[PDB]
């Protein structure tokens, strides 16, 4: 039978993804969990699963199917995983240690790169402390790197936290843009009203 | 927060912004070089000025750190490379004066043209015509007059400018807590803050003199042989026991003796190993040559080139509708963008040059994971050595016959081996004394050991003593022979061509041991040697994040420069010359002159 399948293409086939410092989160809680992600650019660069195996995923029920998305560099995809260190993992997007889900990443050079440089994607470079798991911080306050507060002005020892990317088609595979999306699954000890197809 | 955290944050921000801006500038410069147009010229110009202003303001902001409280050697080296004040230390007047002096020097050297008494309208400039004569002219008087007139025309006009440039650079470097500009140049090899691998600037001169002490015998015998062979081509002008004229070296300055092979050929009956005609018969092209170089490099164990390389790099001249500089160039635009600009033709020279450029690009990619301020070679000589070892290993007959260029029905013999070794010595070991004496003279001038009224006298005396090249005619002190060279008038260090020439053989002999070689060093091929490739990559990956001595230890196992591999390379040629250099007295008498 069929009730209504998941709008997974709405996040996998979006016209433009969101930045890392403001990564979006879409709650999928009332849809038939049809995991057929293969048709979205089957040649995935990184298709890894944490806490669940690849295909048995399609025949298991869950309460929340939260889906997070953002764009990062090709060499930064390794930071999107349980127990990782770096700029992204700590200051932009942190995954829990016992994360149960999947992480899909694919190249988006043609879409998110221009001959003149796509400076629309920003990322946090400085922060007072490391972010917690699944924490979101839009703060754009001047990071105090010196001793005085700087009164909230950009100057010496007072740098702006967010930095741009400037993706270009001539960049190397390591620096080309990579659209990444995470499929978070968690059981809240609640009745799973919806499940996947049989 | 201690100063270390502030330094780390500033260095990260600078890394990001400078990476972006340097990629922009390199892209503009590439667009200009690959297409000479006013629009691309303007793009290169504005990109360059913005990048330079960003670098200058960042260095100004970097000077706010004492650098003595920091302990991280990486941050220390990054700041040292970024905190160098440079020419801004002197007052603005001295800055403008030195900039004007440099500009006029470069323009006078480039726009220099010599009028001749043969015809009132028969002037020829340096690059074309004059070099053709100095290389292929067999007439004594013609090349003598040309060599004398070029100097009398350029050095006499540059001497008043050099008298200002020397003192200006001395007052500039001394203000930077240095002894002189010659010492400032030697700061590249300076290693401090790491016991066991440290290296002072003063040790460079001593080590170079020690290496030249061992280079001398082979060069003495080579010079004796070249002289004995030149007596037949230029009779009534050369001495049996005396030095050689300066206009019989094959070039305007005698830096390279490649043009003397046509006269000092040991066995001219058998032609040299040339695979030019063998390539056109197989319908070879730039793409095939570069793919063969790729297969050779990956066979050693190095990563294959980026996809953007084959897509963005221009490896063949599109014709005179997209005009570009035909010089072989390696372009590391940054952020994983690597390209090679070369008008690749179907010739063995183009094959070797493509191998060299591919090796340079491999080196550039090795340390790609290092900071922007450390994305460079260990020193000014390591890059060219790493690029030349590949061309050396590729030019061997075994490699040419393994890839299908040389016919299997041909076994090398001693005659062709001696010919190739001697032709290589004409440019490798034949130029070492020139570079050494030039650098020593420049150092002594910058230090002040040579008074202003003894420049040319000391220059010619050192030439006679070291290189064994006598002056053809009396030269007044208003002359300036050193300024006649490009690297001297354009304010470019020249010792790199010596230290690099030694590092070349140091690496060649260090990689042959890993490949389990069983013959002479000139027949070694690092192809299919995974251990040698990994040993080399373990050093190319470091780049500038570690001292150059430690990098040298990784490959060669020695902490300091060594010239024994250089002599081992030309050991068969040395024995052949010794066996042949007995018909006349070996050496030269500096007291004799052709006038
Ligand atoms: C110095 O800083 C760099 C970059 O933060 C770091 O990788 C290195 O381990 C530090 N070394 C020390 C603690 O001396
Ligand atoms: C590396 O070499 C292999 C074998 O030739 C090839 O399949 C692959 O596409 C190459 N990759 C790059 C980045 O050139
Ligand atoms: C390297 O290996 C290839 C393939 O086995 C072979 O064709 C080539 O002759 C070898 N080259 C040398 C000289 O080791
Ligand atoms: Cl000279
Ligand atoms: Zn080179």
Author numbering:
A (entry chain A): 331 to 528
B (entry chain D): 19 to 613
What do the study authors state?
Focus refinement on RBD-hACE2 region resulted a reconstruction map at 3.0 Å resolution. The cryo-EM density map was of sufficient quality to enable us to build an atomic model of the RBD-hACE2 structure. Briefly, the side chain of Q493R forms a new salt bridge with E35 of hACE2, Q498R forms a new salt bridge with D38 of hACE2, and K417N loses a salt bridge, these key mutations resulted in an enhanced binding to hACE2. The structure of the BA.2 spike trimer with hACE2 reveals an extensive interaction network in the RBD-hACE2 interface, which is also conserved in the BA.1 spike trimer-hACE2 complex. The network of interaction of the BA.2 spike trimer with hACE2 is more extensive than the WT spike trimer-ACE2 complex, providing a structural basis for the high binding potency of the BA.2 spike trimer to hACE2. RBD because of an additional interaction of R403 with D405N in BA.2, which is missing in BA.1.
